[PDB]
Every structure is written in C-alpha cells, then in structure tokens.
Amino acid sequence: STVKEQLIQNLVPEDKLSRCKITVVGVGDVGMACAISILLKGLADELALVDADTDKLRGEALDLQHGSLFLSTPKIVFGKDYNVSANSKLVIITAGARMVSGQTRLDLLQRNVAIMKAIVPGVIQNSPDCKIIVVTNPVDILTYVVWKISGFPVGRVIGSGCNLDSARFRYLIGEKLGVNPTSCHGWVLGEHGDSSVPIWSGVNVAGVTLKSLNPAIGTDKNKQHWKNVHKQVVEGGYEVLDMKGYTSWAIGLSVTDLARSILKNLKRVHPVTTLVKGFHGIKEEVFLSIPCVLGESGITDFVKVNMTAEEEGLLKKSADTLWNMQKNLEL
Amino acid sequence: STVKEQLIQNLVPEDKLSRCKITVVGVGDVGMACAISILLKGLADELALVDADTDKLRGEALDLQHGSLFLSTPKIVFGKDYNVSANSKLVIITAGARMVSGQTRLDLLQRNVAIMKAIVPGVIQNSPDCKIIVVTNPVDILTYVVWKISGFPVGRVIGSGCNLDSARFRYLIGEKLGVNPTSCHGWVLGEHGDSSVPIWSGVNVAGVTLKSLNPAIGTDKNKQHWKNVHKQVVEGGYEVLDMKGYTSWAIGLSVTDLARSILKNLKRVHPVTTLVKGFHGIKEEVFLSIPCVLGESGITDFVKVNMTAEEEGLLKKSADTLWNMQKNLEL
Amino acid sequence: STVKEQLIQNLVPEDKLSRCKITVVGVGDVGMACAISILLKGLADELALVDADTDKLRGEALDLQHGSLFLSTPKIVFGKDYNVSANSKLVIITAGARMVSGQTRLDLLQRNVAIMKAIVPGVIQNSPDCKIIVVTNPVDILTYVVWKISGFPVGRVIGSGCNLDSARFRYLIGEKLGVNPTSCHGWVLGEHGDSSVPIWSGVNVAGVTLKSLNPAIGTDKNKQHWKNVHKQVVEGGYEVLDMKGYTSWAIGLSVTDLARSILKNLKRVHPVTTLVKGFHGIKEEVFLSIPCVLGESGITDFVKVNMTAEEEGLLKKSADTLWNMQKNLEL
Amino acid sequence: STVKEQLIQNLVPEDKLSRCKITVVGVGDVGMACAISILLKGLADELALVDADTDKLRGEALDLQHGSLFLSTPKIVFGKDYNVSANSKLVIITAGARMVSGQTRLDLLQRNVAIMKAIVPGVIQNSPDCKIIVVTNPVDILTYVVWKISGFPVGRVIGSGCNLDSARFRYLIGEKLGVNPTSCHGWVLGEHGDSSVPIWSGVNVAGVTLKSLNPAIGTDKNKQHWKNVHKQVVEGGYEVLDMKGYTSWAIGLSVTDLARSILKNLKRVHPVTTLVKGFHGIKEEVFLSIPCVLGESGITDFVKVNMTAEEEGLLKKSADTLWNMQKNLEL
C-alpha cells in the first residue's frame, strides 16, 4: 500500500541479526575524539555511546548520525544506561573528572574511583565477555580499580598506559634526527604521568646492537641532552592542556590504535598497563605499563625487557609510588 | 631457557581464540585478484584459501604470506581440503573452467555443475552457517546449482550477478558525460552475459524525475546512440579476455565490494543473483539478478523496480532462457 | 662528531623541497573537526593551521603534532599570520562567529563580512593560485563576499553549500526505507539554512524514471508525510546546536569530502555554492548552491537540473532573499 | 541540443589541467601487481601504463578501466610509447626477462641491460624531473645501468633493493616469536639475491640495547638456529617461483610502500639500492642496498649502520661481486 510496502521486498525469514560492537563511556572531548577516529576506520559496525549527561550526548550522537553518509558503520546508538551496551566486544571508559592547569597529577583519583564504582561494573553485567580499555587516567590505578571492581581476567581489563607517552616520545625523538616516529623506536614505561622511566637501553633508528642510540652515546641520560626528550615528554602532557584546556586528539588516536590491534587480532605488541604483580622485583598487585602483545582475546603475553640496574630501579620505584596509593576502597 | 622462553611472557589462561574468516575456493587469476583486494582492505583477519591444484596454491599462498608486513590480517591459511575452511563467515567459489576466446557463453556449464557437485557442498559441511558469493559464471545457473546442492536459504547463497556489468556500465556511461561512475547511476539486470537488459527507465546523473536520462532523451534504446553503451557493455566482457586472455581485476573488486557490504553490515543495495521465482511474471525457480539489499545476514530484502512493459518483457525472457537450461542434474 | 653527524648521512645536493598543502583558517571546533579528518585520510602532506587566537592554536596544533605517529602527513605547521600558508593548494576558511541557540540564521552576517575583509584576502596574497572552500556560514553570502573581496574565478572560490544538508537528507530519508544514504539519492538546494528547497522531482533508491520516489508517490510535498524529512532536515541543523552547543563533526566530514574530490581530481559532482548569476531565471550575482562537478581546478561545470515550475519557483525565491542581502559593503 | 549540451554546464575558462602521475613500464604479473595496489590506495590520480606488448596491455589496461567505479584515481592511460608518460612524478621500470626455475641469479643481466638501453632513457626524455624505482632485478646492477644510462642524481634513481627481503625476513622472524613483522625489526642488506648479509647486530622486538636479539643470543649466526631464518629468506625467493612460476604480489606491495613514502613525503627510512661508492671500505661506483631515508625528492640521506667486523666483511664482499660485474657496456 505504502512506498515501503511498494519499493522494498522483505526476503522472509532472517530479517534481523547482531554481533560485534564498540562502546564508549562518556563523550567528554576525549571519549569523543576516541569516537570519530574509531569511525575514520572500520573497527565497528555498531558503536554505542553511553553517557550520563543525556543532554550533550543525544546532541553529539545525532551529530555523528547526521554524519552517516561517510561512515562504514551503519549503526550508531546511544544510551543513558548500560543496557545500551549489550554484547559489546570492546568498552572504553572515558568518564570521570578531566584535567585542570596545575591539578593534573593522580589527584583526579579518589574522585574517579567513585566515578568507577558506579560507571564500570554494571556495564559489564551487560557485555559479560567484554574487553576493556581504560582511558580515564589514573589509568594505572583505575585499571586496578576496574580490574578489581569488575573481576575479569586482566587481559580483558587493559589500560591506555604509555602507548600514548611512548608515541609522544617517538615524536620528539624523531623531531631531532629528521626521521619518522615510526622509523625511530624508543620505549617509555613505568607510570603514565611523571614517574616515566623512558628506557634508553633500547632505542633504535635501525636495529638493536645495530643502531641502538647507545653505541654513539652523546650519552642519553648520564648527560648531553636527550634527558630533555624525556623531560619534554612528561612536561609535554601538561603544556597541552594549559593551552587548549584539555588533552583530546592524541589520546584518541592512541586508543583506536589499541582497538585496531585487538579487533583485527594484529598481535602487535604494545606498552599498556597490566599487573606487574611479580615482575622485575615488584611483588604486589601494582598495575603499571609494560610492553605486551595484544590480540582478539586481550593481553596474550608480556614482554620482559632489559632495564639497566636502575631502569629496573626507577620502574621498581614507580611500582611502589603507585602501590601504597592502592591501599584502597571508598574508606 | 630459550629466547622465546626468555623474551616473551605467556599471560596464563586464554592463549588461544577464533572467529570471523574469509575463504576463497581456487586462486585462478580471479579467485586470486578477489584475494589480494580482500587484503588491500580490512575485511578479514583470517583468510583461508582452498584450491585442489596444491602446487600453485602453496606457492601463491606463500607469496601472500611473505607479504605479511603490509596486511592488517594476521592469519592466512591454505588447504587441499575444506577442513581448512572451518567457521568461515564468507566463502567465495571461483573454481571451474574459465574462459576461451569464443567459447565463453553459458558453455562452461554442464562442465561446471560438475565442478560444483564436488567443490561446493562439503565446504558447507565445514562452515555450516557460512554465506556464499558465487563468482564462477554461470553465476546465475551455478547460484541455482549451489543453492540447490547446498540447501540453505538464498540470502546465504548469493551471486556476482551484474554488480559487475552495472559497474562496467556506469563506467562507459560516465565515459561520455565526463562524470564519475559513482556520480552517474544506471542498472543492468536479467542475465550476466548477453541477455542483459540494462534498465534505462531509471538512469540518473542527479535524481529520478530529476536528472533521469529519459527527460532529455537523445532516446536511450529507441535510437540515437546509447544502446551502444549497452552493446559496449556486453561485448565489453568479451573484448577483455580476447586480449589479456582472461577476466581478472574488475571481477575481484566487484566481489570485495559485495563482501564489504555483507561484512560491515552496510545494507547497501546491490544487483546480485537470487530467486526471482515469482516476481514480475517469472514463476519458476529461475535465479537471475535484481537490485537487493545486502547485510550481515545475506540478502535481507529485494528491490522491485519499474521495468517498462518490455524491460519486463526482456527480463521475463532471460528468466526463461535461463530457465529450461535448469532442467538439471548430471543426467 | 654528533649522533646526528654520526647516524645519518646527508645525500648532497637536493636536501630540501616543497609542493601541495592544505590550510585551515581558525580551529573553532569545526575548523578543527575539518582538520583531524583531513588527517584520517591522506589528502595532505603539509597542513598549516592559521588562527588568530594564538593561545589555543599552538595548543591544538601541538596536540596534532604529538599525534604524528599515526598520520601519513609529515608536516603540520601553524601561524598567527598567513605567511604560514605559502603555496597552499586548498584553503578552508572557518573563522567568524559561530552559533547561538536562537541566533543562528543569516545573523552572523554583517558580523562575518567583517571577519572576512580581514581574514580572507591577504591569505590569497600568499597562495595566489589557491582554491577556497568557505565553511563559515553565510556560506552563500560569504562565498559572495570572499568571491568579491578576493577576485579570482569562482571555480576557485567555492562553498560548503548544501553538500551538508543533502547528506543530512539522504540520512533521514534512508532512516525510513532501511537503506544506506549512499544507496538512496535526493538533492536539497537553494539556501543552506531555511530556504532549502529539497528537489523531490529527482529522488531515487535505484534510478530516475526507474525508482524515482515519485512514481509511487505517497506524494512527496503535496502531502502524505515526507515534507517532514525536509522539515526534519532544516530544523535538524538547529536541534544539534541547541544540545552539544555547536555544529562540528558532520560539517567536517562534508568538507573533507569536497577536498577529497578536488584533490584526487575525482570530478565527482556536488551540491556546492556558486554564481547562479543567470540560471533558471536568476539574473544577479547571487550565489546559492547547485549540483556542480569538482576537480583539481575548481568547479569545472554546473549541472542544470529540472526543478518543477515551483522547485524553480522556490529556488527563484531563495536567490532573491539571498539577493538584496547582498546590497553590500561595510557601509 | 544534446543531452551533454543539455545536462552539463561548462564553467568557462579553465576546463583543463594536469599534475602528478605514476607510470609503470611493462605489466608482466609484477609490473601489474605493483599496479592494482598503487590503486588500492590513493597514490596517484593519473597512472599511465607503458608496455611494448601492445596486445595484453590494452587488455589489462581496459580491465582496470572497466574497474573505475572503486578507484580514487580518475585517469588511467596506456601507451606503446613513452610519450604517454609525460610529466610523471614516479616511473617504475618492470620490464626485461623474468624468472626461470634454476635460471634466476644475476643471469637475467646482459639480457636486461639491453632491455634497458632501450626502455629506460627515452622515458626520461619525457618526464625529465621524474623519479625512478627500478624493480627489474639485477635491481642493483640495473639501478647502476639506469643510473648511468639516464644521468640524473641517484636520489632520483632508486631500486627495490632489499626492502623486499628485509620484509621477507621480518616475516619469518616473527613466524617464531608469535609477534607481528612490524613489531619485530631486523635488516638484511648487501645484495638482493644470495649475497644477503642480514645484519643481526641490530635486531629488536622492543629496542636496541633494549630487546636486541643479541643479549639473549641463542646465538644468531655463530649457531643455534636463526641463520636459517636467513637461509630461509634467500632460498625463500626461489621456492616461490618454482611453484606459482613467478614472483608477483609481495614485490608489488614492497614498491608501493616505497612510493607511499616518496609521494607522501613520509621520510620513512628504507633499505633500497644506491651508490655505496665510498662507504664502509667500498670505493667504486657499486650500487647495493643500505638503509636510507626517502621523501618527495628521492633519497635524502643515508643511514650508516654498525656492521660487525665481518657484517662489514660480507658487505665489503657483495660490493665487489656486484662490482666486476659492472665492467660494462654492450661490448
């Protein structure tokens, strides 16, 4: 009778389905930049966005929706509740309390565990076999919170860690040789913040033992400027926000780069946060970041690097900072 | 003890998985071009290639394998048997008996149903809920064979149909206006070969009723050159092979464009082959191609166009050609 | 002596170059979303961002810079001046005075011509043979301003027009059939705002004369709900901002889709703004949008559609609204 | 009068242009695979294909042409002559005399310099400022021939070198750790064939000094299986052809990966062939491959690695093999 009933013909049984989604908790600039980009790629055919600030969301959501004619992801849903997350393959938590010129440290912490207790677990009740990337901040300590508060195998529960930083690093690093940050290699681990031990021991622009930045050593630590790449790194997180008044794009790209790996089962190794519970001297459910291999099923395996006496020193140190911090609950 | 046992750390339980594959039966130039391209995109994280010509395959396969460092699909497997297809989401049959300057018609037919009886069903015993794209040729009649020989809902069993042709068409068509074949629209259906009724009734370069090529009518059929676009289309299939001695690339791209749609659940409508069993006068399990909507779960729905008295005429006609042909078995 | 002087060897003459850039004036949410996306593609190997709000820029800029390790565009520059735009191939003006719940109409107009007189011309003194996409708003009237104020051939001076709207349209439109907005076709022209005559005469979901939405006509205008798709369209621009408090993503994607076409010389036809100076009755340097073909060198050619008596009516009407408005200068 | 003259409107002056092309000499399987892939990306908006086997070409060419509706490159041209190459940015020579089970060595050499004398120079007379990637084989010695026979700055004249091999390597290498070949690093240089000194000194799976494969040393050379990765590498070139009867895909991907870098000015370092004329002891216009940085303008700079006494030994050796070979002309 209708144009519908006239133009289109409904091929009988099996006229409904479902499968493999992406969901992002909260669309604060970040939650959001980590959105669009999941889109400017084909990671997900259903991307559901869960926020509690109902207003902006159905606004932002509809923006993406109007945007359809460009995406390669037909379904884009939104909810005020986690029911709207049913059967996600990957959930990315980016809700809490973001940034303030000065503030930013692990200050947004007792503050966020609260955000979590609520936000996180519950999401999980929905997509029971989900896999979580934690972006919030605090990534370490939150990964821990979530880890704890959720109760599924770390592998499933992962964190943004230093994937970010390391990248921030490869950038600057390459800013000096005149070589692509893809084409220079260096690792920064420990904490995602100011306890960041880069790990010069292993820094190419060709190969290990091959072009290790060490063999030509204008030092790299023990002097002659390069420490600064590292001081530039850390500070670098800060300087951004002071100016645009937040940390957006670059966090996004990072994550989607984590997703990319997980989803396409790339088994591309990564610096992410996990339980170093009993690695290089650390023996206490401290989650900091370490180079790990990521696939379909989470963290598969870990990569146990060669930190020099103190590279291990420093790391041993973060571990601990990060550690008492965790004498937790809402108490 | 080992570098393995030394460099990498095995994150305990859940160190194995599996999920959503692509498989291509036979790697004859086509089977193959329809391969690489599935690769120069991220449709599949596991693409298994099943051929019986064991030799060339483990050669070609290894070529792609050496090729890893570029692909975004970690696993690429090969088999002499269909066991190597376990739990594919999409199987693409491109094995039979391909082309010969002159030959090419629906000649490669009794010839191929044979290829099928064997090849097809069996593949299915493995990935029971698979979805099939039939490229072989004969696409129509084979779709039918396979349909029949397999026994799963058409929706699942699909064919290359004219997606190809229509594209071949939009090309030429646009070759004259100086407008992109994306940006010109026209549909050619019926048979994939020489019974190809384009369907001028509906041919934009803007909109329907809007810029329909009809309203300015330097005719389009009933004279003044354009029939030729169509004569150029059909012939066009032939001229290729005469020269490179086969039909490769363009068939590939087409298919992957079918996959793309299926896999990312795009619900992008397409001209593909299916059972017009009881549409526009045809009432007999004749499979020719018609504009249909494709998603995750197969053909979802059909699009019932407005063929003019004879557009319906011609189509009614193919249907039938195609039809007795189907008084089949190996008999 | 140095690691530089040690690791890398400088292959003598020809150790410097330059060529084909993208530049975006102002990074207000939009200027910005229209940024990242130019990045989540390979349109430009040098993208310079010119803003006057020096603060946020060197913040936002550095955000993208830290972001390097993901981009396929090595150079990302920023300036407080247009000198920083030298030899751009495409400049996209997105600076002025953006949005306000209610406000939004062609209010941001005397306001912006001012923004222009300054911003625009000057940019041009730098990249003399540049090509401009105008996003600001007002797109029509601004295209005109810029056109005027710059003095290069429209072809070069283009505007966002309704590429946006039409897309906004294909969306909703497809929201009802259950078909992709790529796979449904419809055109909305005239003004980018509330004088938007869609152009039902030509609306497929197959072909013109073929599946024109007209032949089944649950009307489309002259009743039985569809006008609303159009009322939904226009309103649709408004509802967004009311909520997220601005119009970001979808404008971005649109533009980059214009760039894409221009840059890769796609000669993909588009609804954009240009001088309808003497088309369908309009005879006065009124710039509204019409379906045009875009390539390397600008607008190449125009597409002269079939508006029904009044489709031509309405268009004839916008033209004029838009027209007196243009009895301009700063006077 | 015509639909053309009716549907489309010709926006006056500037209705013609030109700029930045890709050209590939000969479409032998390789010339060809290195074709399609340049397409399954947006490297070129005009790709001209020059072959002398006029027949297959206008066949293969037309195949790609029919293929339009998928490409993001509007113009695809073909010639029997080099006139059809006018103003290419990148020319890729892949014509000569390809492969034979056994044969393959630097046998296809006096044979090819001939192919060159003709093919190469002449191409250049057309696109005088072109940049050449040499794929033929012999890549080394041919790079040299071409270098010589053309007369433009090496930087411009480059070769496939070991980009290939190294990749072939990262593959196998990663086949053992269970880590992506992107995520494992190792370099193989010297000759592209059997004089391939990998360069274990520098082989990560993290960082240099960091995860160098050396520090855990199940040796890597001086025993305990890994030499084989290398023996597997070289042999690996051979085993392919024996089976599919040629080397296609993987060479293609490699090149396009060279183009990608050149064209988008990525300044991504690469192992390619160039004049090691006076590096690590070699002092004679011997072209073998070394890690170099590639951009818009050619090889920009070289990367002078740390070969161990003999890594330098072996390299010193190839150099020379490769060297007398070059006491050339057609004499």
UniProtKB/Swiss-Prot annotation, chains A, B, C, D:
Gene that produces this protein: Ldhc
Q: Which domain of life is it from?
A: Eukaryota
Q: In which tissues is it expressed?
A: Expressed within the midpiece of sperm tail (at protein level).
Residues annotated as the enzyme's active site: H192
**Protein name, please?**
L-lactate dehydrogenase C chain
Q: In which pathway does it act?
A: Fermentation; pyruvate fermentation to lactate; (S)-lactate from pyruvate: step 1/1
Q: What family is this? A: Belongs to the LDH/MDH superfamily. LDH family.
Q: How does it assemble?
A: Homotetramer. Interacts with RABL2/RABL2A; binds preferentially to GTP-bound RABL2.
What are the BP-aspect GO terms? ATP biosynthetic process; flagellated sperm motility; lactate biosynthetic process from pyruvate; lactate metabolic process; pyruvate catabolic process
Described by its record, this protein's role is as follows: Possible role in sperm motility.
Residues annotated for NAD(+) binding in this entry: 28-56, 98, 137
- Its source organism is Mus musculus (Mouse)
The EC number(s) given in the record are: 1.1.1.27
Residues given in the record as substrate binding sites: R105, N137, R168, T247
Q: Which reaction does it catalyse?
A: (S)-lactate + NAD(+) = pyruvate + NADH + H(+)
What GO cellular component is one of the record's annotations? Answer: motile cilium
Note one Pfam family from the annotation. Answer: Ldh_1_C
